[PDB]
Design a protein around this ligand. Structure first.
Ligand code: BCL
Ligand code: BCL
Ligand code: BCL
Ligand code: BCL
Ligand SMILES: CC[C@H]1c2cc3[nH]c4c(c3C)C(=O)[C@H](C(=O)OC)c4c3nc(cc4[nH]c(cc(n2)[C@@H]1C)c(C(C)=O)c4C)[C@@H](C)[C@@H]3CCC(=O)OC/C=C(\C)CCC[C@H](C)CCC[C@H](C)CCCC(C)C
Ligand SMILES: CC[C@H]1c2cc3[nH]c4c(c3C)C(=O)[C@H](C(=O)OC)c4c3nc(cc4[nH]c(cc(n2)[C@@H]1C)c(C(C)=O)c4C)[C@@H](C)[C@@H]3CCC(=O)OC/C=C(\C)CCC[C@H](C)CCC[C@H](C)CCCC(C)C
Ligand SMILES: COC1=C(OC)C(=O)C(C/C=C(\C)CC/C=C(\C)CC/C=C(\C)CC/C=C(\C)CC/C=C(\C)CC/C=C(\C)CC/C=C(\C)CC/C=C(\C)CC/C=C(\C)CCC=C(C)C)=C(C)C1=O
Ligand SMILES: COC1=C(OC)C(=O)C(C/C=C(\C)CC/C=C(\C)CC/C=C(\C)CC/C=C(\C)CC/C=C(\C)CC/C=C(\C)CC/C=C(\C)CC/C=C(\C)CC/C=C(\C)CCC=C(C)C)=C(C)C1=O
Ligand SMILES: COC(C)(C)C/C=C/C(C)=C/C=C/C(C)=C/C=C/C(C)=C\C=C\C=C(C)\C=C\C=C(/C)CC/C=C(\C)CCC=C(C)C
Ligand SMILES: CCCCCCCCCCCC[N+](C)(C)[O-]
Ligand SMILES: CCCCCCCCCCCC[N+](C)(C)[O-]
Ligand SMILES: CCCCCCCCCCCC[N+](C)(C)[O-]
Ligand SMILES: CCCCCCCCCCCC[N+](C)(C)[O-]
Ligand SMILES: [Fe+3]
Lengths: 281, 240, 302
């Protein structure tokens, strides 16, 4: 039940809501008030999802898929079988996610640490909220949302993509991908850097942070070092996801044409638009 | 076809890898226990990993994990229930006692050494060639606590030499004694340095270091422990 | 307003650190560079020194050889016209030898040979830098994790421009050097093989990429959350578990039911990221050499 050093941490207090009421554990798990909130939202939603599985008449999970109200319903409510169920399910997800964040807050307090983790998570929650809430609304129908199904959701991605041409040309999509790639690069390195110091050549003595710092300057002649790389990672991550939201929230709202074409602005600057040569003359 | 071979292969690779990974993360704090310190009955499906030994770098010995765990210190906590899963109330001053968000682990009472064998961390007075290079110099600022009362003055900055980074502020108390204050728990300001976890009356309670040119891993833990716990335990004195 | 430690609030400086001197041929290391106070807000200010040396040198040389062999080509397209060069910078493209030539090394310089030269330069550039990544670890008596990890990356690059072109019978099947053109190639490669969303390696590869962001978010925020007890000093915490390691593990055990150790979390890391291009490289390699169309394969998986 407890890790060998757990018990002196298992003190009372730190709850946001409801005092000592739900201040307790279950196995390793901490239960907030919000431990309870998230359970209830998760129960409900998983129920409604099965209820969809029935109106649809599959149980195979590769097939089950739960679409929004179609564009006619706009931002009104659909009949259950006609889009209501997704709308509730979406409400329930949100409830789950937010609650799961608040509980992370409540654990943070009991342990006496910073709130960086709940913090960073709220960007994921925010990315989801963009695709199923902020964009639909600004566009004008729940129908612009992606559907809850394993492959049907990849399908939304693909058609939505291909609606505006090759989606590569969405400029914030370019920014957002550069972080995804960069972050993975940095996670690759960081991990490798520590492991190689903690696990040196053989019967050789566990290297040091100074060795770590040294390895990089030798290699690429600078080292962000160890408060840095953790500050770096948190940032590249949060940024990737931040720009991911961006590129979608603008798509379909303030730009509805082909993304490649937006690049015409650059090429049509008047001090070269009319020159003859290159790819564009 | 190859594809189906490759993918079925991979899902198998991935499964033993997680298994690897997971047992590798079982080198500390395992095996599990009951709230009394008895070995719990159910350690889950994963075995303890076959143990590994770390050769530490300045004749400072050896580390082999997994190994024997013990909080080598008293825990002042009374059970608050009849069954597993409830908080254990402090029986004293959780601050003075070092339980809760004020916990510390009995680390070694040596200091961390840089790569060259010298103490990683130094007061800047003895840190040859070191100087504040950007940002408000704290040294000289008075220190406020969360009760909006003054508690001391900064009388040096203890720098990390090899990463060249401020780790603690040393503070002079009315006493005339000093304490260290972790850099990460103070706001350096334009005219004061504000400390939110501790009200003025608790600074004296911040633990002391034996050498005054030197902190040990044990003393870092007792200190950081202490001032983190104030967030919870000082909060009645913590004026807005 | 509690302090967050995303940004250092007082910077501190001392004599330029020339670094540990294990077996590093100290002759080859450079001189210390300046110090960016800018950088110093985030992490270290010390720019430099750098160990250059034959492999560093060769790599670095050909690295520019490659870069330049492309850029002139762009210029030759621009009509040597710097307006055009700037206007059309993403549209220019160095493409591989026409499939006519296949794996031939005899394509006219103007019809694909300029591409082979560039690639040949990149090949040597990248492999020598790989060897550089290894030797640097050896000379400090460190593990060779950085090299292994680097292979994973090298794998997908090897597969894109080298192995798959060879396995398909022509250089034309490789990626053109160009900003907008390699995007198009990519969008097209998918279209031809029946939508990569049905390549399960592609799907696996996405799960890791997404997860690398997931984890580096988790790890980073955690270390910052406990740097108030010196979490970032991960080597010593491995060697002697502090409360930092404990509150870290514990926050996560109480949230989701299990947890890492300080050495552990970094194994989750290197593998979670290394699997992105490892899976990736495979998804691509089978693409078109062995599966013409991932939908059709998705249908009856043989
Ligand atoms: C992965 C599968 C596809 C592919 C799909 C994509 C897609 C889709 C995208 C990119 C994007 C990028 N790709 Mg690609 N790309 C592939 C293989 C590669 C390889 C290679 C194998 O050698 C290279 C060198 C690149 C390089 C690049 C960059 C131009 C860009 C961001 C790099 C990055 O984030 O690195 C992370 C970290 C680094 C340290 C390297 C950064 C390199 C810098 C210098 C690039 C910045 C460009 C800038 C200088 C342009 C001029 C700016 C001014 C206006 C003048 N790609 C293959 C063929 N690539 C994104 C892009 O925005 O392209 C336009 C994007 O949207
Ligand atoms: C954000 C970008 C796009 C999108 C584009 C893609 C693309 C492109 C791909 C996926 C893929 C996946 N997507 Mg998606 N996906 C989106 C939004 C979502 C939502 C959203 C509700 O927030 C979720 C939960 C998922 C979930 C998933 C997984 C089924 C799968 C692997 C992801 C992964 O490894 O992440 C990293 C996270 C972890 C490793 C942590 C553990 C995650 C586990 C696997 C979560 C599974 C949940 C799932 C089974 C449903 C449970 C819900 C109920 C409680 C039962 N996507 C939006 C619309 N998604 C890949 C796939 O192969 O699936 C077809 C793929 O190729
Ligand atoms: C044909 C397809 C188009 C295209 C169309 C789109 C579209 C359309 C979208 C993207 C989006 C994205 N694209 Mg694109 N894109 C293409 C090609 C690419 C390639 C390519 C290789 O070059 C790259 C690298 C990317 C990369 C990316 C990312 C920038 C981004 C997806 C991640 C994200 O948003 O996280 C965001 C993260 C989340 C939503 C996850 C939230 C998770 C929540 C909070 C919690 C999950 C809990 C879960 C239920 C738990 C289950 C319980 C169990 C216990 C586990 N694209 C092509 C050109 N791209 C998506 C985006 O930007 O979204 C904003 C998007 O909508
Ligand atoms: C229309 C586009 C198609 C598609 C076609 C492809 C193709 C084609 C490919 C990918 C690939 C990838 N796709 Mg896809 N993909 C689509 C939609 C998506 C979506 C989305 C829908 O949201 C996402 C999230 C992704 C995500 C991804 C990545 C997981 C994956 C590449 C990982 C990587 O980091 O390589 C980045 C890393 C590298 C290229 C390694 C290179 C390392 C070298 C050595 C760098 C050297 C630098 C050089 C020497 C110069 C020095 C640098 C300068 C100094 C700056 N795809 C759709 C279906 N996708 C790749 C893959 O693996 O697929 C299975 C791939 O080949
Ligand atoms: C900065 C954003 C990055 C990141 C970070 C991140 N995610 C986080 C955290 C952080 C900081 C947490 O601490 C938290 C965590 O606890 O991780 C272990 C979490 C988390 N991120 C998760 C997933 C996740 N994050 C993703 C992405 C990202 N997360 C980014 C890379 C993705 C992507 C890539 O798509 C996924 C799938 C979970 C593992 C976890 C949150 C778990 C949680 O919220 O619990 C509440 C909910 C339930 C137990 C079940 C949901 C119940 C629903 C009502 C039913 C399902 C509805 C849903 C609409 C189904 C749709 C399925 C289809 C799409 C197939
Ligand atoms: C698991 C795969 C992930 C990953 C990991 C990864 N990448 C890595 C590593 C790892 C673990 C290394 O250790 C290695 C590295 O060196 O880290 C810094 C590397 C590396 N990944 C790189 C890039 C890179 N990785 C990528 C992707 C990925 N790398 C994934 C996210 C991509 C993408 C997203 O496509 C890119 C762009 C390099 C930084 C580096 C390898 C460098 C190299 O091989 O180049 C050789 C040298 C040259 C080409 C020199 C010429 C460079 C320029 C064209 C000229 C201008 C610059 C010049 C230096 C100026 C000189 C001026 C003079 C006057 C002095
Ligand atoms: C111990 O040493 C060290 C480590 O440890 C082992 C390391 O890991 C590393 C390794 C780390 C790295 C190389 C990381 C370096 C990071 C980068 C180069 C940055 C990565 C990110 C990018 C390339 C993306 C750049 C994007 C930018 C600047 C965009 C900025 C914002 C905007 C333009 C505004 C957005 C608005 C828009 C688009 C509006 C759109 C409008 C309409 C459509 C209308 C190093 C060096 C190290 O030293
Ligand atoms: C250095 O330090 C660090 C640590 O340790 C010292 C750490 O561990 C970690 C954490 C990281 C790891 C252990 C590595 C592995 C992690 C991942 C690959 C992330 C992906 C995670 C998952 C797939 C797990 C997702 C699981 C969840 C959300 C919980 C599972 C939960 C259930 C089945 C029950 C859910 C709960 C409910 C319904 C409500 C609460 C419960 C009640 C009964 C009420 C990090 C980041 C770290 O930096
Ligand atoms: C500004 O003015 C100057 C003079 C500086 C000119 C400017 C230069 C510019 C603008 C250069 C621009 C270059 C760009 C934008 C390059 C972009 C490349 C991109 C977008 C992607 C690259 C993908 C390519 C890969 C996957 C290629 C793989 C190559 C191989 C694996 C090696 C191939 C192997 C060969 C040909 C065999 C050779 C022989 C041996 C040793 C076996
Ligand atoms: C902060 C909660 C956000 C939950 C988002 C849920 C989206 C669907 C909600 C709309 C349901 C019905 N309607 C249109 C009649 O209001
Ligand atoms: C060589 C790769 C280094 C990448 C790190 C760059 C991060 C810079 C962040 C801004 C630093 C300064 N500040 C606070 C003034 O913004
Ligand atoms: C590092 C361990 C975590 C790995 C995550 C494994 C779950 C990913 C599931 C992806 C679903 C994939 N597939 C093959 C059907 O496309
Ligand atoms: C993917 C999530 C895995 C979480 C693993 C959690 C381990 C829990 C150990 C069993 C505890 C049992 N319980 C709840 C019946 O008391
Ligand atoms: Fe780390």
């Amino acid at each position: 039940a407890l890790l060998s050093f757990e018990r002196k941490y298992r003190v009372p207090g730190g709850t946001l809501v409801g005092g000592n009421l739900f201040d307790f554990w279950v196995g390793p798990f901490y239960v907030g008030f919000f431990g309870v909130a998230t359970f209830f939202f998760a129960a409900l939603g998983i129920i409604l999802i099965a209820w969809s599985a029935v109106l649809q008449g599959t149980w195979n999970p590769q097939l089950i898929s739960v679409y929004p109200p179609a564009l006619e319903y706009g931002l009104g409510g659909a009949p259950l079988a006609k889009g209501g169920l997704w709308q509730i399910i979406t409400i329930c997800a949100t409830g789950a996610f937010v609650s799961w964040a608040l509980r992370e807050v409540e654990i943070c307090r009991k342990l006496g640490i910073g709130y960086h983790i709940p913090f960073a998570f709220a960007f994921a929650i925010l990315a989801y909220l963009t695709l199923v809430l902020f964009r639909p609304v600004m566009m004008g129908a729940w129908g612009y949302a992606f559907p809850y199904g394993i492959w049907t959701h990849l399908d939304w991605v693909s058609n939505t993509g291909y609606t505006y041409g090759n989606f590569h040309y969405n400029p914030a999509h370019m920014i957002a991908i550069s972080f995804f790639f960069t972050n993975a690069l940095a996670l690759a390195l960081h991990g490798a850097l520590v492991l190689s110091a903690a696990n040196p050549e053989k019967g050789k003595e566990m290297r040091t942070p100074d060795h770590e710092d040294t390895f990089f300057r030798d290699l690429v002649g600078y080292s962000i070092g160890t408060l840095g790389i953790h500050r770096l990672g948190l940032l590249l991550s949060l940024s990737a996801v931040f720009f991911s939201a961006l590129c979608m929230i603008i798509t379909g709202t303030i730009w509805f044409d082909q993304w490649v074409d937006w690049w015409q602005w650059w090429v049509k600057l008047p001090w070269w638009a009319n020159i003859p040569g290159g790819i564009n003359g | 076809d190859l594809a189906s071979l490759a993918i079925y292969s991979f899902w198998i690779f991935l499964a033993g890898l997680i298994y690897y990974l997971q047992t590798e993360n079982m080198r500390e704090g395992y095996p599990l226990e009951n709230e009394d310190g008895t070995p719990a009955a159910n350690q889950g499906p994963f075995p303890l990993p076959k143990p590994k030994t770390f050769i530490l770098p300045h004749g400072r010995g050896t580390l082999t994990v997994p190994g024997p765990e013990s909080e080598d210190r008293p825990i002042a906590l009374a059970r608050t229930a009849v069954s597993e899963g409830f908080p254990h109330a402090p029986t004293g001053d959780p601050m003075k006692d070092g339980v809760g968000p004020a916990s510390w682990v009995a680390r070694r009472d040596l200091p961390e050494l840089d790569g060259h064998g010298h103490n990683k961390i130094k007061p800047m007075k003895a840190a040859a060639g070191f100087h504040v290079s950007a940002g408000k110099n704290p040294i000289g600022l008075p220190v406020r606590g969360c009760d909006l009362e003054i508690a001391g003055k900064v009388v040096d900055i203890w720098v990390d030499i090899p990463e060249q980074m401020a780790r603690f502020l040393e503070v002079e108390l009315k006493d005339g004694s000093t304490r260290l204050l972790p850099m990460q728990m103070v706001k350096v300001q334009s005219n004061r340095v504000h400390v939110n976890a501790l009200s003025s009356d608790l600074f004296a309670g911040i633990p002391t270091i034996k050498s005054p040119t030197e902190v040990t891993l044990l003393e870092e833990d007792k200190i950081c422990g202490y001032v983190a716990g104030g967030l919870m335990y000082a909060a009645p004195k913590r004026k807005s | 307003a509690e302090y967050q430690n995303i940004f250092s609030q007082v910077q501190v400086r001392g004599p330029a650190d020339l670094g540990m001197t294990e077996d590093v041929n100290l002759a080859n290391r450079s001189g210390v560079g300046p110090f960016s106070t800018l950088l110093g807000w985030f992490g270290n200010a010390q720019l430099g020194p750098i160990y250059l040396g034959s492999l560093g040198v060769l790599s670095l040389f050909s690295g520019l050889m490659w870069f330049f062999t492309i850029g002139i080509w762009f210029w030759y397209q621009a009509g040597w016209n710097p307006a055009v060069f700037l206007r059309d910078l993403f549209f220019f493209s160095l493409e591989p030898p026409a499939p006519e030539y296949g794996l031939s090394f005899a394509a006219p310089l103007k019809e694909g040979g300029l591409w082979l030269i560039a690639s040949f330069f990149m090949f040597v550039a990248v492999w020598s830098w790989w060897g550089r990544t290894y030797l640097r670890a050896q000379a400090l008596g460190m593990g060779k994790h950085t090299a292994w990890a680097f292979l994973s990356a090298i794998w997908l690059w090897m597969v894109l421009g080298f192995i798959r072109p060879i396995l398909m019978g022509s250089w034309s099947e490789a990626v053109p050097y160009g900003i907008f053109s390699h995007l198009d190639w990519t969008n097209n490669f998918s279209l031809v093989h029946g939508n990569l969303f049905y390549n399960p390696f592609h799907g696996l590869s996405i799960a890791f990429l997404y997860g690398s962001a997931l984890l580096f978010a988790m790890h980073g925020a955690t270390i910052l959350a406990v740097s108030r007890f010196g979490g970032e000093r991960e080597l010593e915490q491995i060697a002697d578990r502090g409360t930092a390691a404990e509150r870290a593990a514990l926050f996560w055990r109480w949230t989701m039911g299990f947890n890492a150790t300080m050495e552990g979390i970094h194994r989750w890391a290197i593998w979670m990221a290394v699997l992105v291009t490892l899976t990736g490289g495979i998804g691509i390699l089978l693409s078109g050499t062995v599966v013409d169309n991932w939908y059709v394969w998705g249908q009856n998986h043989g």
